[PDB]
Design a protein around this ligand. Structure first.
Ligand SMILES: Nc1nc2c(ncn2[C@@H]2O[C@H](COP(=O)(O)OP(=O)(O)OP(=O)(O)O)[C@@H](O)[C@H]2O)c(=O)[nH]1
Ligand SMILES: Nc1nc2c(ncn2[C@@H]2O[C@H](COP(=O)(O)OP(=O)(O)O)[C@@H](O)[C@H]2O)c(=O)[nH]1
Ligand SMILES: [Mg+2]
Lengths: 50, 436, 19, 204, 426
């Protein structure tokens, strides 16, 4: 099941991973952040529908 | 460690007819599938493993698939001086011609002959014990070489996949040309060749004419003259498996030390010394000047100046009795040479393979018996210019929809025309981004 | 992976989405 | 068979020529200094959604229709012509012919309705920079009918003063009204072929 | 193994074919009686393309002969190499042509072509792999222009894939040997453009000029003109019958020479053409052959190619040859005059080689050019047609045999649009 603390922790891990990949090369981080925001808006729409 | 050969198109089968003669001469096999009774052997009972196979009693048969649609050159071979040597079934001749049409070569007629050649390929592979790779020999400027060749490449990649492929393909020259509709076939076959053939080696008709004009001293050369030194180049490439090499390179060294990126596999070729009898014994053949002539831009089978680009990497196969000190000093001299420049990200980029077999001589030929020879295969970045010039030729033809109806009358649409165009564009971009 | 690869990924995704 | 024994002689090359129509969403089409066009293709020329680039280093994406019409279009020379967007809006009969935004180099930014040039249509055209702020040199709203706007319009000068009336970029002897809103006075009359010939000046 | 079938119609077609089979039979080495008495064994290998062994070596050529009067079959059988033609291949009528396209293509067509399709289909089944059809006929006559054209329609309706070479002679102002040439030329070209694949257009003034200038002959005649046409027709199929350094099949010729499906009216020429007086002075070398080819005085059609633009061209060569010299010549000639070739095609000229030159020589060639200066050929006939038809001249011979003036107007329109297309591509 879904849990807000699980979501927050996974978001923190995603931030750390995107920080690492940006330190490698920034453009990959830009793409990853855009993808993150897009499924964030998708899940927001799903939550509104529910 | 056998290597199989596929010759597609009239050009491919002619090169094979002029190259298997070199192999059967190198391994002392009589031109009817046997050895002479008397001991006239250079040494060894398996120097011919990579190309032939004894069957009960000294009856060797080459590992060759001579596939062509229109049967005028296949039966020319069938009635030529090699009848008791070739396998009667390997020589696959179809029914009608491809007629410079990739459509007819790849969809209409190809589909009913690829599955007929594939079974012979499978039988040869199953007979083989340590199969090493494929060597394809074809012409992109025609129908069978481009169309049927690309179809066979795709349908061998789908099946075997992991095995290496070395594609010796000819391109049209920037100015000298025979076929009118060759740009279409060239681009269509280039798209297929890009992501299937492991290592692409390039040849050019005018780029061999001018060498035969400036070096071999022939003002009226011909195909029967070009094919002989093409056979020489492939023999220099394959001699490592055959003969005992002190510093020898198997077929996978080419892909391991000369393909830094999988997209980038397009290679200039050179061969020294291109000398005849008149000046052969007057000049002195030494590892310094033969190598220098190899790296000069006037002795390349691909008409392209390496000055406009940067040598990414290089391989040098040496035949004959050569001591490694001189080749090491020679590559040092090359690294100190000014004109040719390297991309700075490759500090070591010279593979130096060496064998213990001197180059062979064919009776009635032009090249003479020599001590040592060198074959230089260079992954440079000047080949993007070749592709771009061919593309600029293609654009004018495609703008006016000329000759397009002949193509589209078969299964070919315009979508693959456009996708081959954009594939060549992507290749251009990749080569230029490699850049500095 | 290359910078050309990532920028071409951007281009390809944008082209596919412009429908 | 019956497939062969059919009226196919002429028809074979006729259908081949038809199949050579050069249409469909091709991956790309190129020339030398030509119109690099990517998008859906039909009727032998640019028809459908697609982007076109050419000699003027201007890469504009719009809905092509055989060049006898065109859909929504976005024309711009971005970071090479050094301007974000030059035109943005729908097209009709190879002309915007409706809601359109245009951005000159620095002259102005015109967002309005207009058909076959700015010869008719009601809209706005801020003839000054800094359009996000009141520092804009002026803001005009009304009927464009030429460079001389030639209609009933109204514009604010950014000092608070407003003009409301008939306009031929000026000097149309049309009864208008002008508001010294800062002072608190207003002048109604006739801008007869000039800034002033007659009228009445009053106290709001 | 790639079969070719030859179709002869009209008096001119019958004579030209009776000379073409003459040349082919003598070069493959079959004597007049019908047996095989050649010398070399390389000719025996491809005789199937043109011949069938019946029983006991009596080779029968694979040809169809058609006409409307027996007065041409009599001459065909009488002439040398007459006995070779299979007696089943003499479909002839009884009435006669009459020079009316109506009798050629509508009335007598029904009762003759239905009878000759049996022979052509039987021949097609008798051979195994048809490469295509070669038909030698006329455009200025009644049988070749009309009945030959209707047979072209029927054959293309039957086999769509096979190519067609149409060796057609056309009328001319200076050598106008009859008075209704425009009608039977337009009413034939209208179907020829739609229906054929390679239109080998010839004439008589060009052949007479060749036999007068290049051959220096004193009294040239139909024998000599037909001999030249036969030489060209053998050179065009040299590749299928003999191997060489670079083979060239009929579909390859069509692909390399046609940029648009209805732009397929070529113009042909032979090389070398030297006089018997000065046989032993010229040099049979590739530069001389190419110089003799690329000029107006050798083309076998009333076209001034320098008054136009060679869209494409093809050059067959025969003899032990160097493709290096061949293609350097074909490139130097191309780069000397970039104006006379089209702008948007690189390498306008295709080349091909074979290793056996024709008997009696050692080095030959054959030039086939797709030019845009061939439009004026049809322009002459079009203006003649306009002038004659504006006053309904001779029209009753047509409009009294099930024909309508709408046919004439549409044929004129088709010629006009074709010549417009040539003119546009310049
Ligand atoms: N160097 C060299 N090139 C050849 C030889 N034969 C053909 N070519 C090249 O092949 C190109 C055209 O392709 P084709 O020879 O027709 O081969 P293909 O793919 O089988 O085409 P089709 O015979 O019509 O099926 C020409 O431009 C020549 O450059 C040859 O013997 N030596
Ligand atoms: N070049 C050439 N032309 C010919 C020869 N025989 C006839 N012609 C011309 O070609 C045309 C052929 O049409 P025609 O003989 O009337 O056909 P038919 O009478 O219906 O069989 C004639 O008008 C002649 O002028 C020949 O041997 N050589
Ligand atoms: Mg071929």
């Amino acid at each position: 099941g879904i849990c807000p603390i699980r979501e927050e922790l996974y978001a923190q891990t995603f931030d750390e991973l995107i920080r690492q990949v940006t330190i490698n090369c920034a453009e990959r981080g830009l793409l990853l952040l855009r993808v993150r925001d897009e499924m964030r808006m998708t899940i927001a729409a799903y939550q509104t529908l529910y | 460690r056998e290597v199989i050969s596929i010759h597609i198109g009239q050009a491919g089968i002619q090169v094979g007819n002029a190259c298997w003669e070199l192999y059967c001469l190198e391994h002392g096999i009589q031109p009817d599938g046997q050895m002479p009774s008397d001991k006239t052997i250079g040494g060894g009972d398996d120097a011919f493993n990579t190309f032939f196979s004894e069957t009960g009693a000294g009856k060797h048969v080459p590992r060759c698939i001579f596939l062509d649609l229109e049967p005028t050159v296949v039966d020319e071979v069938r009635t030529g001086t090699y009848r008791q040597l070739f396998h009667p079934e390997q020589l696959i001749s179809g029914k009608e011609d491809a007629a410079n049409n990739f459509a007819r070569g790849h969809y209409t007629i190809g589909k009913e002959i690829v599955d007929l050649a594939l079974d012979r390929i499978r039988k040869l592979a199953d007979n083989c014990t340590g199969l090493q790779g494929f060597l394809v020999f074809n012409a992109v400027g025609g129908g069978t070489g481009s169309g049927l060749g690309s179809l066979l490449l795709e349908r061998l990649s789908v099946d075997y996949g992991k095995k290496s492929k070395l594609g010796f393909t000819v391109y049209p020259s920037p100015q000298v040309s025979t076929a009118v509709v060759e740009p279409y076939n060239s681009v269509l076959s280039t798209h297929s060749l890009l992501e299937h053939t492991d290592v692409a080696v390039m040849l050019d008709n005018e780029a061999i004419y001018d060498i035969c004009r400036r070096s071999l001293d022939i003002e009226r050369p011909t195909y029967t003259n070009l094919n002989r030194l093409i056979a020489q180049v492939i023999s220099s490439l394959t001699a490592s498996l055959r003969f005992d090499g002190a510093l020898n390179v198997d077929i996978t060294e080419f892909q391991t030390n000369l393909v830094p990126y999988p997209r980038i596999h397009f290679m200039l070729s050179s061969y020294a010394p291109i000398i005849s009898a008149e000046k052969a014994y007057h000049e002195q053949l030494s590892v310094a000047e033969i190598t220098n002539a190899a790296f000069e831009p006037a002795s390349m089978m691909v008409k392209c100046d390496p000055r406009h680009g940067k040598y990414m990497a290089c391989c040098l196969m040496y035949r004959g009795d050569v001591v490694p000190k001189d080749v090491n000093a020679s590559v040092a001299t090359i690294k100190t040479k000014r004109t040719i420049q390297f991309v700075d990200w490759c500090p070591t980029g010279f593979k130096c393979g060496i064998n213990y077999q001197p180059p062979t001589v064919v009776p009635g030929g032009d090249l003479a018996k020599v001590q040592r020879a060198v074959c230089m295969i260079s992954n440079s970045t000047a080949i993007g210019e070749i592709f771009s010039r061919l593309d600029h030729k293609f654009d004018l033809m495609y703008a006016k929809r000329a000759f397009v109806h002949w193509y589209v009358g078969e299964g070919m649409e315009e979508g693959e025309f456009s996708e081959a165009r954009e594939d060549l564009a992507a290749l251009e971009k990749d080569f230029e981004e490699v850049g500095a | 992976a290359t910078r050309l690869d990532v920028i071409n990924l951007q281009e390809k995704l944008d082209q596919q989405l412009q429908q | 068979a019956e497939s062969l024994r059919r009226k196919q002689g002429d028809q074979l090359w006729k259908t081949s020529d038809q199949k050579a129509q050069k249409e469909g969403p091709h991956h790309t089409v190129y020339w030398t200094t030509g119109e690099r066009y990517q998008g859906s293709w039909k009727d032998n020329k640019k028809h459908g959604k697609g982007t076109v680039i050419y000699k003027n280093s201007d890469k504009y994406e719009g809905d092509w229709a055989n060049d006898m019409r065109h859909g929504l279009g976005t024309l711009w020379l971005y970071r090479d012509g050094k301007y974000v967007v030059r035109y943005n809006g729908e097209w009709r009969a190879d002309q915007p012919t409706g809601h359109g935004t245009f951005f000159a180099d620095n002259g102005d930014t015109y967002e309005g309705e207009w058909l076959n040039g700015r010869r008719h249509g009601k809209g706005r055209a801020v003839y000054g920079g800094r359009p996000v702020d009141g520092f804009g040199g002026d803001v005009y709203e009304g009927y464009f009918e030429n460079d001389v706007k030639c209609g009933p319009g109204t514009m604010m000068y950014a000092n608070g003063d407003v003009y409301e009336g008939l306009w031929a970029a000026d000097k149309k002897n049309g009864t208008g009204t002008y508001f010294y809103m800062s002072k608190g006075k207003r002048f109604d009359g006739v801008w007869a072929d000039g800034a002033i010939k007659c009228g009445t000046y009053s106290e709001i | 193994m790639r079969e070719i079938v030859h179709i002869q119609g009209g008096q001119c077609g019958n004579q030209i074919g009776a000379k073409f089979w003459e040349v082919v039979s003598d070069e493959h080495g079959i004597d007049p009686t019908g047996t095989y008495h050649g010398d070399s064994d390389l000719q025996l290998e491809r005789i199937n393309v043109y011949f069938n062994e019946a029983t006991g070596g009596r080779y029968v050529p694979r040809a169809i002969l058609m006409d409307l009067e027996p007065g041409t079959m009599d001459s065909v059988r009488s002439g040398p190499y007459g006995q070779i033609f299979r007696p089943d291949n003499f479909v002839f009528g009884q009435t006669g042509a009459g020079n009316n396209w109506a009798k050629g293509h509508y009335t007598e067509g029904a009762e003759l072509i239905d009878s000759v399709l049996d022979v052509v289909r039987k021949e097609a089944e008798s051979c195994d792999c048809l490469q295509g059809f070669q038909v030698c006929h006329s455009l200025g006559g009644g049988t070749g222009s009309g009945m030959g054209t209707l047979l072209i329609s029927k054959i293309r309706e039957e086999y769509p894939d096979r190519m067609m070479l149409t060796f057609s002679v056309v009328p001319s102002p200076k050598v106008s040997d009859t008075v209704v040439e425009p009608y039977n030329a337009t009413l034939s070209v209208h179907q020829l453009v739609e229906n054929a694949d390679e239109c080998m257009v010839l004439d008589n003034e060009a052949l007479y000029d060749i036999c007068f200038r290049t051959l220096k002959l004193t009294t040239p005649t139909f024998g000599d003109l037909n001999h030249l046409i036969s030489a060209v027709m053998s050179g065009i199929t040299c590749c299928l019958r003999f191997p060489g350094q670079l083979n060239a099949d009929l579909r390859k010729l069509a692909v390399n020479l046609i940029p648009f499906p209805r732009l397929h009216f070529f113009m042909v020429g032979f090389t070398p053409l030297t006089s018997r007086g000065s046989q032993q002075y010229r040099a049979l070398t590739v530069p001389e052959l190419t110089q003799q080819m690329w000029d107006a005085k050798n083309m076998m059609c009333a076209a001034d190619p320098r008054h136009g633009r060679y869209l494409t061209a093809s050059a067959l060569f025969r003899g032990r040859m160097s493709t290096k010299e061949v293609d350097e010549q074909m490139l130097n000639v191309q780069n000397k005059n970039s104006s006379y070739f089209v702008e948007w095609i690189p390498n306008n000229v295709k080349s091909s080689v074979c290793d056996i030159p024709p008997k009696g020589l050692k080095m030959s060639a054959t030039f086939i050019g797709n030019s845009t200066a061939i439009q004026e050929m049809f322009k002459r006939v079009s203006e003649q047609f306009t002038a004659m038809f504006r006053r309904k001249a001779f029209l009753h011979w047509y409009t009294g045999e099930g024909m309508d003036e709408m046919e004439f107007t549409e044929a004129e329109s088709n010629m006009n649009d074709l010549v417009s297309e040539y003119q546009q591509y310049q």
